[PDB]
Amino acid sequence: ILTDENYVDIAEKAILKLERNTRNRKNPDAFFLTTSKLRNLLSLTSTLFDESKVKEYDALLDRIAYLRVQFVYQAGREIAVKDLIEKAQILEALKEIKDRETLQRFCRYMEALVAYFKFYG
Amino acid sequence: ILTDENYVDIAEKAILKLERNTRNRKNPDAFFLTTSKLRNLLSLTSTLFDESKVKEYDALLDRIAYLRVQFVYQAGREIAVKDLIEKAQILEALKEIKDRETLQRFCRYMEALVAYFKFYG
Amino acid sequence: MTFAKIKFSAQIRLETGLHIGGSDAFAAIGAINSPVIKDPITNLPIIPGSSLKGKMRTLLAKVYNEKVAEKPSDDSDILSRLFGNSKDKRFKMGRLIFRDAFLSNADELDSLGVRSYTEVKFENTIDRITAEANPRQIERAIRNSTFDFELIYEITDENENQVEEDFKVIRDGLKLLELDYLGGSGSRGYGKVAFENLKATTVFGNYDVKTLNELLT
Amino acid sequence: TFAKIKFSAQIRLETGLHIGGSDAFAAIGAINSPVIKDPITNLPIIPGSSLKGKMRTLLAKVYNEKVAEKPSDDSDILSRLFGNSKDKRFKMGRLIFRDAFLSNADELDSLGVRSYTEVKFENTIDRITAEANPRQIERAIRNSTFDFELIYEITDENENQVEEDFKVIRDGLKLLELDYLGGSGSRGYGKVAFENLKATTVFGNYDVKTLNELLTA
Amino acid sequence: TLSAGIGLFADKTPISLMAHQTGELEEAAKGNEKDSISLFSSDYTFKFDRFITNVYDDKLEQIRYFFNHQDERGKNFIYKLIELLRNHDRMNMARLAYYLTRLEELTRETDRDKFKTFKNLFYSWYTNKNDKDRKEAELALLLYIYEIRKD
RNA sequence: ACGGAAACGCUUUCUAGCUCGCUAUAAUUACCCAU
Secondary structure, three states, rough: OOOOOOOOHHHHHHHHHHOOOOOOOOOOOOOOOOOHHHHHHHHHOOOOHHHHHHOOOOOOHHHHHHHHOOOOOOOHHOOOHHHHHOOOHHHHHHHHHOOOHHHHHHHHHHHHHHHHHHHOO | OOOOOOOHHHHHHHHHHHOOOOOOOOOOOOOOOHHHHHHHHHHHHHHHHHHHOOOOOOOOOEEEEEEEHHHHHHHHHOOOHOOOOOOOHHHHHHHHHOHHHHHHHHHHHHHHHHHHHHHHO | OEEEEEEEEEEEEEOOOOOOEOOOOOOOOOOOOEOEEEOEEEEEEEOOHHHHHHHHHHHOOOOOOOOOOOHHHHHHOOOOOOOOOOOOOOOOOEEEEEEEEOOOOOHOOOOOOOOOOOEEEEEOOOOOOOOOOEEEEEEEEEEEEEEOOEEEEEEEOOOOHHHHHHHHHHHHHOOOOOOOOOOOOOOOOOEEEEEEEEEEEEEEOEEOOOOOOOOOO | OEEEEEEEEEEEOOOOOOOOOOOOOOOOOOEEOOOEEOOOOEEEOOOOHHHHHHHHHHOOOOOOOOOOHHHHHHHOOEEEEEEOOOOOEEEEEEEEEEEEHHHOOOOOOOOOOOOOOOEEOOOOOOOOHHHHOOOOOEEEEOOOOOEEEEEEEEEOOOHHHHHHHHHHHHHHHHOOOOOOOOOOOOOOOOOOEEOOOOOOOOOOOOOOOHHHHHOOO | OOEEEOOOOOOOOOOOHHHOOOOOOOOOOOOOOOEOOOOOOOOHHHHHHHHHHHOOOOOOHHHHHHHOOOOOOOOOHHHHHHHHHHOOOOHHHHHHHHHHHHHEEEEOOOOHHHHHHHHHHHHHOOOOOOOOHHHHHHHHHHHHHHHOOOO
């Protein structure tokens, strides 16, 4: 669950809980999750955040249900993405996405994940 | 039947109902359905999902009727595919595929089946 | 009774869909980096009248000045009595009134192959010596959007015989816009405005446009 | 004296070009790297930005001594036609690259065509251990002919050069045939031909009789 | 102590509009704690002792020290810092953390550690709880971008 | 027989100039299975 107050510090604490590359101490603290892998998940959400500002919710919810396909498929393979969606509660946040304000909150919640990934990188 | 809201959690509950390899407990919980077998069914649907975005429905419905050939032929042999199309209501979903929105829904419904197969594997 | 006021109705059915830039705010973290200007209550693309005035003036400025005007006030007396001038106490309250163009065919773009009225174009640059990339996401309106365009001209009693000279200028301003672009990155596409269904009607009485709509062929 | 010069060349492919975008909600086991389409007709298009980005960056090794680090450092024969934002007098210089959409919609048909964009499966093979990594990218098909619509813009500054500024256009229409018009370029992908060029005067009564015959060599 | 009110006007504005709109702008400085400057508007009412040691000499020198000892940044970077300083959502804390880290990647690596001492010091005063140093740097960027504007 | 009366916050102004969705990438690997 994430509200309009806490959808950022949940996303900050999520990135800090991503377990680093403790192996191979040359250039340490790198994440198993990589940048271009995470942007694939953002490009999904950062085209619904645009269309939610223009369209209504009911003419848009077909692409919203396909996020639950994509966030599982991108995490079902290449296990470092599964490390994200279990720690950052992505699949639980898609359970509560019933309105445009929450659609614009989760699509903005993903942008906080990309922000602190780039900051703590 | 599957609508724009429920075409994913039906597909999630379908994969969980696939009976595992309860025999041969070394590396357990493997499915009788395999990955490269399922991708043969997806490559059928994930080339109509491309052409539906470009072409109309009426100049495309010849390949749609041949899905009912393929999903029966691929399941008439090698019975683990028949375990899929009876549990995941594939042949019932092809009865209601009268429009581009439903064509893009079933072809997207198959992608949720491949997603949770890879995730629960 | 030599005060009339006429309107040029038109239809801006464009090609190479246009990017009249709008809110240059600090955008989202992976979203559209430069949106277009929109109606608030419908979120549809508009073409504002100010983007139609300065664009059609500078095209007409290159034809009717006879010297390079370093200011819009330094335009000649045929531009300043249409688009208005602030340094003249005689050419204020300029003759032309340009209104913002809105989507006419919002229903005709519906039931066709497009869904959203704006498409986002992905446009990286390439660094010259190191060949890096820097991806742009410039929103622009879709191809065959048609915009209702209206062009209020005000026949003041000081107009005299200039009414027919202005229509040689406005039609030529509508003919340069069919050659140059309209707003945004025009040397990379984004222009190609076609003005169709050009006709003049008198929204205020006592003027006859019977011998004028042939000029808008 | 003001004039506009249009160049109606025809961009005909030989190897299918891939001017990409990104359909963000693509599919699994489908095209995960599409081409940019027309948003209504869903025909593949060539933008003017991919043309202008390949005209300049191939004429920046030929008509540019003291090779440029940035596009602002182009040595003022290239900046005169391609624009230069870091200059007092070269901003928006004299060329407009309109988008080349599609011409042969029904000449590709009656050759046997299912879709106007083919799909190519491509497989990054890992050298060690022979791992496979497939990808599916779209291409505009082989005999697709596009509508090149470059527009030149003559001011009173152009004097003697006018004609000097077409050999750089003619070579930009020639240095690109030796290269790829965008694409996943190294392998095929836009070995393209610029057929039957034709310059015409669309404004201002300028003669192009001596101008056409230097575009046929 | 004393308390000042400064009002920035154009030329040929009337002095009755000048002396009143700064006369009722020190009244906003007589109500802060009575020991306060107020600059150009009814907000920016900094404590005066805090205005010099934490805006006019602390931050405005370090903003001047950066952009007069580098080459590739400019007014576009300053303007997007002001816009992120005016709004300040909780989302704009993270959105600014991306925007400053993205520009380390873009510099020429002979200025990256110089910019890194700027953004570790800029993002320090942006994310706080006292809400004090934020509007100070919102003001310190105004007086820097005022003094560098060409005609 | 109102510190009143008459008075358009208004005229002029293109969100514009520069910018390649690019870079690397054999649809391939393995040799059996059923009775």
